[PDB]
Structure 1
């Protein structure tokens, strides 16, 4: 119907604004965070996609888990994630974050950040190259593009 069509284009409108402004939380754990700094470096310039690092979880949209999550740091990662306003997305980057990686069998490591927070995109690698992370970030925008919140509200 006309209203169902209008709701669709309003859905694209709000998605587009969230796709075009992803503000990751300044937050990296280990060597994977070095490649996340390279994605911010001139060659890739994530800023040109509208991606701006913000220190405060209140001002951040995306949490990129870029390094190993140990048991000591697990509660703190969850707390800054809880304090992220919604909508909010997690990119798990690297083997350590993806599933433990080189430390999977360590007594002190969380075997994957997805035991602690819900993860949207998994980026393989140890570390993923800055392009691999960039591909993952741009794969998160397409996930948002497929969001259908307003349309589903209409059919409730």
Structure 2
């Protein structure tokens, strides 16, 4: 029941969800290859708990928006995001997803927070694979409830808990 209502139990389940981040592959653009390189045999996102990679949205919690989110893919991704279990986290990978990138035009959503609740933002073009590990570590200590912004605020464990989805 939501991972709450005991001081030890919420710490425990937050620990589990933090290190057991099961990525949901959503490769969009050239960010995708520097995403996969965070799993190659120089630098693997295969230690923290993300070795296995369930392409299914019904089985993976972290959605890595790796590339430009073109508008014709937005509504589809929409349902794909709703086709995730509720304990889900959404990372915005790359400049084109986090921001509009250099493609300031009619074609691209200029910030993916519009359609999906973003957990962590990561600048870069392409973000070095180790920066992707840094972003998942950021998300790690966020879902543990150990993350603070520049204004001093603690951030909720799971973004996408605060939106009247519909």
Report the TM-score, using the length of structure 1 for normalisation.
0.87
- Residue 87 of structure 2: aligned partner: 87
Structure 2 distance, partners of 1:42, 1:86, is: 32
Match status 1:96 vs 2:110: no
Q: Give the ranges of 4+ consecutive aligned residues of structure 1 lying more than 2 Å apart after TM superposition.
A: none
- Residue 59 of structure 2: aligned partner: 59
More helix by share: 1
- How many residues in Structure 1 have an aligned counterpart in Structure 2? 143
- Residue 78 of structure 2: aligned partner: 78
More strand by share: 2
What stretches of structure 2 of length at least 5 have no aligned partner?
Answer: 146-155, 159-166
Deviations 1:88-127 (A, max 9, x none): 1111011100111011x21111111111100000001011
Question: Aligned-pair RMSD on alpha carbons?
Answer: 1.6
What does residue range 1-156 of structure 1 map to in structure 2 within 5 Å? 7-51=6-50, 52-103=52-103, 105-146=104-145
Corresponding residue SS for 1:87: coil
What stretches of structure 1 of length at least 5 have no aligned partner?
Answer: 1-5, 150-156
Report the TM-score, using the length of structure 2 for normalisation.
0.82
Query: Which has the higher relative contact order, 1 or 2, with Cα contacts under 8 A spaced 6 or more apart?
Result: 1
